[PDB]
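Assemble and predict.
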Amino acid sequence: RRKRLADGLSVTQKVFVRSRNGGATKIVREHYLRSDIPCLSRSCTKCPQIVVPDAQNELPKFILSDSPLELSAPIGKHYVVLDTNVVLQAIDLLENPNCFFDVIVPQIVLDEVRNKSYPVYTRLRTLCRDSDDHKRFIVFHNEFSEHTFVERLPNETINDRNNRAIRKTCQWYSEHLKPYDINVVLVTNDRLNREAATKEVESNIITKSLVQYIELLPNADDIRDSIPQDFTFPEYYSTARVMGGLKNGVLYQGNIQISEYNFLEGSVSLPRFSKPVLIVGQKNLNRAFNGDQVIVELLPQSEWKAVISDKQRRLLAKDAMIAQRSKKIQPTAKVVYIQRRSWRQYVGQLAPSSVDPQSSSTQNVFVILMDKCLPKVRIRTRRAAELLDKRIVISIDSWPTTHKYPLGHFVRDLGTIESAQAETEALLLEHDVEYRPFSKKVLECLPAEGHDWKAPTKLDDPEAVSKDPLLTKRKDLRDKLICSIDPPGCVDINDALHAKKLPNGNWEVGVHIADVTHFVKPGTALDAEGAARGTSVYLVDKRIDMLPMLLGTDLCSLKPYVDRFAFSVIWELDDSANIVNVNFMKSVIRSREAFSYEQAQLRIDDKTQNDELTMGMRALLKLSVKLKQKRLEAGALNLASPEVKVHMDSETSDPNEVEIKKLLATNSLVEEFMLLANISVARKIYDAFPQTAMLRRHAAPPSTNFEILNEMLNTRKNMSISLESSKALADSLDRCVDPEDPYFNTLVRIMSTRCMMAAQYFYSGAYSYPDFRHYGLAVDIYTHFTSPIRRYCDVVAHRQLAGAIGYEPLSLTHRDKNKMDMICRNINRKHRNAQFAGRASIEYYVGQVMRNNESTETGYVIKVFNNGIVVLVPKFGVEGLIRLDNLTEDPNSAAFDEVEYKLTFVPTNSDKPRDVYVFDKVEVQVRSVMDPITSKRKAELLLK
Amino acid sequence: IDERASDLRMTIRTRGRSATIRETYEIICDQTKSVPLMINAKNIAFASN
Amino acid sequence: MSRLEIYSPEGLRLDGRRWNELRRFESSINTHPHAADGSSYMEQGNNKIITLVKGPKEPRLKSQMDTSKALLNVSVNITKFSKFERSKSSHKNERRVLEIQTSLVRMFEKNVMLNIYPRTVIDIEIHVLEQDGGIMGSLINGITLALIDAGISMFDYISGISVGLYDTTPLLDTNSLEENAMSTVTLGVVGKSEKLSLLLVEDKIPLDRLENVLAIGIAGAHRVRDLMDEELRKHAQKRVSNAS
Amino acid sequence: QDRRRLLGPAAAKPMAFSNTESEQELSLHTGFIENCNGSALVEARSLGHQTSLISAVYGPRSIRGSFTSQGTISIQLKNGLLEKYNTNELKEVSSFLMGIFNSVVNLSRYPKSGIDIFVYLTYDKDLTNSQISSLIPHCITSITLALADAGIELVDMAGAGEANGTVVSFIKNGEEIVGFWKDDGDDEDLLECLDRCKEQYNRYRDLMISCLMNQ
RNA sequence: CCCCGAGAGGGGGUUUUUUUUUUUUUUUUUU
Ligand SMILES: [Zn+2]
C-alpha cells in the first residue's frame, strides 16, 4: 500500500533480492514519496516557493538556463533528458564542451549507471557538480517525487518499468515547463520507448535516438564523430559460471601481461601457481588488453607449450603446478572472462592507408593508438580528411567474437603532430595528468581577500584573533634573516633558510616551509583536487600546478619583502653540525631576498658583502658540508642523473639549443638543510602519531639487480659493487672510475640508478620500525615536508606536525589507517606519473631540437645484443637503438659473445672486423625521424 | 588420506592484496585395521585408599 | 567509503527523507488485553515491537520481595527473524541484551512510582518482531506506552530517538543502512524537558559535534512525545465517549 | 573450551570411519543400585539391534515447590556411551512416559512427595551394518520394574509393544490403553499393530512378574 | 501503628537453593 504523511510526504515499500555467496536475501527498504522536488530550472516560478534548505541551511541552486540551446522547430528551446544506455555509451560526448549544455538526469538513470559502471557514474556526477555557464547537469529525483513515481504493473519487466519511469519524467518536465516555452528531448537508443509514443494515448513526448538527436543540432557535423558504436571468438562465460569457477578452484583471476615483442602470447600471474601461466594464441587471449584483470581456464595438458568434470580440472591444476616445478613443460590457459578492463581514453592517429580521399560519404578507417602494446581500432567518420594528420582521442565501444578488431568512436581533436600544443597535451593525458583549470567549486575555497591577502601586523589583534583563534600559537620570526634559494624563474617558493650564531657558541639553523595547511582544509573541493593530483608535474613547456595559482604562486609562496605564514623548524647545533635540540613551530616570516642558485653562489664568492644576511648564508654553507660529510660517513648514497635542459631562444619559440644544468655549491646547501628538516619532522610526527604518520621509505636493492651490472664490470673493466651495505655500495661505485675517460664513472652511476628499488610513501602503521629505513639516504626514518605547495604529502606532514606540537588537533582523516592507505597509494601513483610526464616532456623538446639536424656526438654503449646495440648520448640525454641491419654489412658474419658482451661486425663503410665491447666511447651520428606507425619522434643513430 | 583430493587451497582476498589458505587434508580412519595403544606397562599403577 | 548516496547534495536520503523528519510513527494501545494489564504495539519505520506489562502483582517467590517498592523487571526478546539474515543462535543471554534490559530498568525506576506499589512486581515483556535501526529508541517508546495503558503511575513520558552523524551532517531517526555507515547517538528525553534519561554513544564521535547531535535528538524526541501523547488522547477520548 | 569439563584441544576433530516377523529375547534384573530406592536392568537382543538400558527411581522425596495432596512424577532419559539421540526426542519420550505412569502410579499415597525416575540409555548398538520407537517398550518395562522394586504402588503392571513404528502400552490384561505412539508406518494398519503389540505386552508382563517374584 | 469486646482481655503486621560462552550488511634536492 501507500501511506500519506503530514508533510505531504508519502511512503511505500521497495523490495528486491540480492544474491551473495550463493545466498538469496530478500532486502526490503522503505521508500518515501515527497512533493517538494525542485525542477532546478531558472525559468521555473513555482519550485522556489516549495523548496527547503539542506542540513547546512542552504537552499539548492536552480542552474538550468532560462534560455537553453534553441533548435529548429518544433524543438525550439529545449532541455535534454538522458536514458541509461546513452550515458554508458557516450559519456565522452556528454563531456564535450560543444554539445549537451542543459541536461536532466533522472534518479533512476543515475542509479542504473552507478550499478552498471562505477566510473561513469562518477564522471556523470562531476558534470552535475561541476556545472558552469557552459555546461549544466542536474539530477531530478523522480523516484522520490510522488508526481513522477511509477510502480511495476502486473506482468511487466523491470527494464520496461524504468523506461516508463524516465518517460514519465519527461512528460512531467514537459507539462511543467509549458508556460516557459521549453520543450524536452528524450535521447534514447531503446526500441521499446517509441511504441508507447507512437500510440501517444496519454501525452506527447519528443524522443530522438542518440544518432537521430545529434542530427538535429546546429553543430551536428562537429559532434557526429563522437557517437559510440569463418572468424569468431569463443563467447565469454556467463557471470554465474565464473563466480562458481573461482569458488570451486576451476577458474583463476589475475592481471595479464602482453609484451610489444609478441602480441600472440600473454601471461597471467596466479596466486596458486609459482610461475606465470602462459596464454598462447589469439582466440585464447580473447580480446584481452595488457594490464586487464582476466579470468582464465587451464587448457588440457596436450595443449602445453615450451577434461569434463570439476574434479579433473582440479587434478589438471595440480599437474600444472608440478609441471611448473619441473621446468620442462609449461602449462597454458585461455581467458574466458574479463573482470576489470584497463580501458581509458586512448590517444592515437588515423592510418593514411585506410582512408580514401575520393570518398565523400561516411567511411571506415583505422586509428593507430600511441600504446605500442595495443591493437588498432575501427572508426566511423566523415571528416576523415580533417583528422588525417592530427592527434585524436578515441574510446572503445565493443569487441565481439565476430570482429577481428575492436570498434571505437572519436572523442576529441588534440591537434597536429610534432607541434608543441598537440604533443604536450597528448603527453600529459597519456600519463593520466589532469591539466584542466580548477573548477569554480575549487576556487571558492580560496580566501575572500584574493591577491591582497596579508598576514596580520599584530598577532594579538582582537579582529585577527577573532577570525583566527590559533594565531596565538603562531610564533614571530619576522626579525630573522630569511632568504630563499631557488631556480631563476621560480615563483612557487616552498623553502626558506636562515642562520644565526647563539651566544653559547652554537648555531641556530631555521628551515621555513610554506604553510599550505592554513589554506587547504580537509573536506573541501580544494583539498579534494589537491589529493587527486598528488603532485604538480614539471615540463619545459608548461607547469601543471597541484594548487591554484593564487595560492601556490603568492599566498603560500614564501616571496621576499612580504609577511608570509610558514611552518618553521629550528635547530640548535654545534660547529660539527650535531643536533643538540630541535623545535617545531608555526610562524610568520618575511623573506629578505629570493636568490637564484647562481646569484646566491656569487654573493658568497665575492667577499664583497659583510652584511648580516650574507654572513648567515656563508654559515649555512659551512654547516651543509659538515652535514653532507656525516651522511657520507654514515652510508649515504651518491647516485646521479643530471638530465639536460632544453634552452629556448628568446628570438624563436621553437627550441634550438640543448645544454646541461650544473650543480653549484648552493644546490648542496639547500639539499642538506631540506633533508635535515624532513628528518627532524619525521621523528617528531612519528613520535606523536606512531600509527598514522605520513612517511617515506626506500627498499634495499635486491642482489639480482646488480648481478648483471657486476657481470659486465668484472668481465670488461674487472670491477665490482659490494652490495653489502649502502656505504659499501657507495665506496665501490666511487672507485669505479676510468682514467682515460672521466665520464665513465658518471655512466656507471646513471646506470646503477636504474637498478634501484622505487621509494614509496606510506603510513607508520603499515610497517614495522626497521622497515622505515631509507637505503639511498641511510636514515632510519624520513618524510616529505618541505614542499607543501607542489606536494600533497607535505601537506599531510604539516597537519601532523601541527598536531604534534599542539598547535591544532589533527584531522580524523589523517588518523584513519584506511584513509591514510588511500592517500599513500594515490600520491605514489601521481608521483610516478609526474616524473614520467616530466621525462617525456624533455624527450619531445630534445627530439624537436634534433628534428632537422645531424651532428657527430659522443656516445656510450650501454646495452649489447645480437640484434644490435644501444648507445647513450650524454649531450642530448637520449638513448638510441642501432639495429644490426643498419649497424654493419653482412649480418650473417657478425657474432655476439654474451660472456664478454662483445659484438663483432664489419662496418658498412669498411671491411675490417671491429669488436665493439660495452662501456665504449664511440662516435655517433644523430638523426631524428618520426615512425610512420607509432608516430613517435625516435632518434635513429648511426655509429662511426 | 586420499592420494590426490581435488580440494586444494582456498583463495581469500584482502583490501588489494591476495592470500591463500592452506589446503586442509581430510584424515580418514580405517574401518577395520587398527594398532594397539603403546602403554608404559611399568608405570600403570592401581588405586587404593 | 560508501558508494551509496547516504546524503545527496539535494538533501535527500536513501529512503527519501530529509535530515530532520521522523519515520512513520504509528502507536497502538491495548493490543493484548487478555495477556497483560498493559500492552502496546509499536511501528516506528520497519521496526515492529510488542510490549507487555504484567502487574503490579504478587511475586512468584517471597524471597524476591521489597516492602518499600515494587520490583521492576524487563526482558527483551529480539527474535531470530528480526533482521534480513536470520540469526542461528538466540540472544536471550547475550551480554548486549542483558545491558539493554538493565538499561531500560534503570530508566523507568526513576520514572515509575514504584514506591506506591510495595510488595508487588511489575514484569515487562518485549518482543521485537522486526528490526531496522533505532531499535533502542523504539524500545523506550514501547515501554512508556504500555506502562501508561496499565494505569501504572509515572512522573512523565520518556521518548527515545536515534541520531546519526554522517560527516558533518546530522541525520534524525536513522535506519539500519545509515547506522552501518556512520556513528549514531541514542537519546532518551524525559517529557518536554532537556533532561536525558538515557545517553548512548557506542561509536566514535568528535567532541565538537556531540552537543549539536544532542540538540537534534532532543528536538526529535519531543515530536515523538507529541505523537505518543496524541495517539493516547485519541484512544482515551473514544473510550470515554463510548463508556460514558 | 568448557571450564567445567576436559574436552581436550579445539583443533582436534573426531575420528570418522570409511569403507574399504522376528522373535525377541530380553534379560531382566532389579535392585542392583544401592544409591536409589529402585532400579532395573533391561537388555534386549534381536536381529541387527541390541539394547541395554538402566532405570533408577529416586523417591518419594521432599518437594520444595508446592503443597500436594498426591505425588509428583518426573522422568528423564539420558544418552548412553556411543549411540546418541536428539535432546528434543528424549524429552518427547519422557513426556510420553510421564503420561503413561501418571495412569499407573497410585499418586494418592504420596502427598507432597516427588518420584524422580531416571532411564539411562547405556548401550544401544545398531548393527544394520526415528530409531527411538523401538526403545520405548523397553523403557516402560524398566520403569515398571524399577517402581515395583522401589515399592511404589502401581494399579497394574504396565507393559508395551512395538510394530512398524507404532508403540502402544497396555494395562488390565490388554483390555485398555495407557499410551499410544505412532511414527512413519503405513495406512490403516492400526488393528494389526494393536494385536502385535499386545503379544509383546503379554510376553513382557509375564517376564516382569517372573522377575519381581523369583529373583 | 492494625482488627474484635465498652473500660487495662484477646487476635494479627508478612525470611531462605536448581541448568556455560559468539552476536548485524629508476635514489635525492630545488623547480
Ligand atoms: Zn519547477
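Chains C and B do not touch (no CB pair under 8 Å).
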